[PDB]
């Protein structure tokens, strides 16, 4: 209702209205075509499904959380959980694409027999069930329900707590920073960096075994763009949560947190152009 | 005696052209303006026969209008069952490249020819067991671009070495040889009488051959490019030809000239295959721009468009009762239309 | 009922397709073809099969086709590489055989079906060429030429002309090897060129290229 | 001697196929029209048939 929140809602609506058509268009261009049913395109379909899920659901839920209608605690937890459920699936789909792109160059002769679309579907299903586990961990019982009930009893009322639904209060920072950020957000980032440096070393070796320099510079620029995009979109919000946990006396503005959140959702808009559009086949199918 | 004999040949050809224009009273469009038009026909896809991994080069239905043989580049000759999308047999092939396939009109033999210069005859009943190579017919020095069965006993085959041939199966020899083209003989069609068969060649000429005699009864030259595929009008008095110059032509046997030309200004792509329906009213022409055009075969108007494919269509078969039209493309999907 | 045999045939097609898809298909075009065939002959269309360093290669010789090339050529779309063999010693013999080979090379290069497919170029019979270059000059075929009679510059100029005939830039590569009579070197060059084509194909498929 | 023989065969066959007569075009075109109008009943593509008789539903 405030001006800063109004700016946040406007940017979130913009990111949703950009990210939904791109992902629908990626799923469309794969569906209509029969030549885009390889394993790597199954991975890009997995990311596009997670991505349209983000753009369709997480951004209305994010606006709902930030406005903050008063409601019961378990209702607010049920509303705030699919956010994590979908963002974790986005990160794991990114990781799966990077692992595939490593395997194509590491073992190029026998790649077709190793990575079949059945094994691709098994790996996508594994990534999704692990994203549901990581997302649904707060509902299993690790939240600030105990603290809210203690405060509710202290104020003297009885029953289920009716609280202004706000994401920092309902969910524990310890879960957000330790479990999520340490265990399931930072190793995908470091593992993608390691994998892409290894892929660049393999490509450099193969090419050396000015035109080569230009091609190498283009591949390096593409990899660095991918890694910078991922590490710019995800890391600010999690660093803010981490500094909020470690030093509670560290006072930060609200607009900083809002910028961090719409960068986190901005990744959902940026992913189709960076991933699907760079393939020549996908541009052919798009133009025709 | 070359120059005066060539002058004689040119004078005789001029006389033939003069006779053809003498018997040409008026155009067909003027007299067929009085026909109720067709309008617009779109067809619903009913099956999608997905069992091939490479490009499907040719198909041929059966007389049951139930079974169809498809032949693909990956070395598979599959007898699809169009009703319940089944696979009755799948035959592995010696040569991966197979540019034609045929199904015997009783449903007891399957013939396929490729670039290996060898027609192959596979029997289907085979009380000993599975399907076996029964007879191999090899007498050509060109690719066998099309072959058809007369009956269960003798097969007429076109080729790429400028010769059609008639083969007996029980012996393995050319019962007769049909010579007198200039270029590669891309396709032949049989009349339902099984006595006369056309054949379209790469010298822009379609020639009609008698089976018993062995001679060109009639010769039609009206195209600007090579003739890809050819198919009789169902009664046996006419045949349509498709060429790479984006024209379909309908040639009449009695009047001995071309009747009509199907050519549209938006089309600059070649015809890969033609066919007729049961009544002879629709001329189905596959193209290179990834879709099929259904032409009104009397009023020369495009009745419809069948655009269910992703790559160009290489074969187009029609059942003998006119139920369903199966178009087979290079993306390995036989789309059956109704 | 019939669906049991339908699924059995589906399984057999899938297994046979997995077996066939791992193999590499190569298209030969010619003059020095027999040297290559007999060299790597370890195990209409003349088809030969050989297995080198955990790869299976099927090489297809189309030389026994007395027909129009434009008809059968689109069958061979989708091969990994086109082994195109040129005799170096054909600059003198006959119009000119070297110009005929360059015309065929230009035709396959600018052919619309082979925009993607890479050409492995074999310039064969280096010994007869190095004798005949001291014997006879290259004024016959090329007016724009400087290093009149020397093997190195002569071979490099022939190679430069062939690779210059390529109109498509960076879409496909031309790999040139002067044919060695040493064992395993020709097959090794074929293996390296095919490996390079497979890696470039995978990088293009990623979009990373 | 081969070229003149090929041209001889060409001219003899060409005279052989020229010696036949030709029916006028309007009559044969009307015959094809009559065949189309005769078999216009049993053509399931031109004359549409609903899902009763259609074996492809
Ligand atoms: N401090 C926070 N305040 C609000 N939402 C947060 C916070 N930290 C993480 N999130 C949510 O978690 C998602 C990532 O798991 C973000 O898109 C955001 O919705």
CATH topology of chain B: Methylamine Dehydrogenase, Chain H
Radius of gyration of chain B: 20 Å
For the terminal residues of chain B, how far apart are their CA atoms? 59 Å
Tally the helices of chain C: what do you get?
7
Using the alpha-carbon principal axes, give the shape of chain B.
globular
Q: What is the CATH level 1 assignment of chain C?
A: Alpha Beta
Give the largest interface pair and sizes: B-D, 59 and 38 residues
Oligomeric assembly: heterotetramer
| Overall spatial form of chain C | elongated
Order of helices and strands of chain B: HHEEEEEEEEEEEEEEEEEEEEEEEEEEEE
Sheet with most strands: strand arrangement of chain C? 2-3-1-4-5-6
Q: Count the strands of chain B?
A: 28
- N-to-C series of helices and strands of chain C: HEHEEHEHEHHEH
Classification by helices and strands of chain B:
mainly beta
Key phrases:
heterotetramer, B: about 350 residues, mainly beta, Methylamine Dehydrogenase, Chain H, four-stranded antiparallel β-sheet, 2 helices, 28 strands, about 5% helix, globular, C: about 210 residues, alpha/beta, Rossmann fold, six-stranded mixed β-sheet, binds adenosine, cell membrane (chain A), membrane (chain A), disulfide bond (chain A)
Describe the structure.
The complex is a heterotetramer of chains A (288), B (338), C (209) and D (57). Chain B has 338 residues and is mainly β. Helices cover 7% and strands 45% of the residues of chain B. The relative contact order of chain B is 0.13. Chain C has 209 residues and is α/β, with parallel strands linked by helices. Chain C has a six-stranded mixed sheet with strand order 2-3-1-4-5-6, sandwiched between helices. With 57 residues, chain D is mainly alpha-helical. Chain D has a single domain, classed as Irregular (G Protein Gi Gamma 2), CATH 4.10.260.10. Chain D has two helices and no strands. The longest helix of chain D has 17 residues. Classes of the chains: A mainly alpha (288), B mainly beta (338), C alpha/beta (209), D mainly alpha (57). The interface between B and D is large, with 59 and 38 residues. The complex binds adenosine. The site of adenosine has 13 residues of chain A, from α3, α7, α9 and α10. Chain D: One of its GO terms (molecular function) is G-protein beta-subunit binding. Chain D: Keywords: Acetylation, Cell membrane, Host-virus interaction, Lipoprotein, Membrane, Methylation, Prenylation, Transducer. Chain D: It is a lipid-anchor. Chain D: It is found in: Cell membrane.
Question: Which SSEs are present, and which pair or pack?
Answer:
The complex is a heterotetramer of chains A (288), B (338), C (209) and D (57).
Chain A: H1 3-32, H2 39-67, E1 70-72, H3 73-106, H4 111-114, H5 117-140, H6 145-155, E2 162-164, H7 167-170, H8 173-208, H9 211-246, H10 254-275, H11 280-287
Antiparallel strand pairs in A: 1-2
Chain B: H1 3-23, H2 28-31, E1 45-49, E2 56-61, E3 67-72, E4 76-81, E5 86-92, E6 98-103, E7 109-114, E8 119-123, E9 133-137, E10 147-149, E11 154-157, E12 163-168, E13 174-179, E14 185-190, E15 196-201, E16 206-210, E17 216-220, E18 227-232, E19 238-243, E20 248-252, E21 258-262, E22 271-276, E23 282-287, E24 292-296, E25 302-306, E26 313-318, E27 325-329, E28 334-337
Antiparallel strand pairs in B: 1-28, 2-3, 3-4, 4-5, 6-7, 7-8, 8-9, 10-11, 11-12, 12-13, 14-15, 15-16, 16-17, 18-19, 19-20, 20-21, 22-23, 23-24, 24-25, 26-27, 27-28
Chain D: H1 2-18, H2 25-38
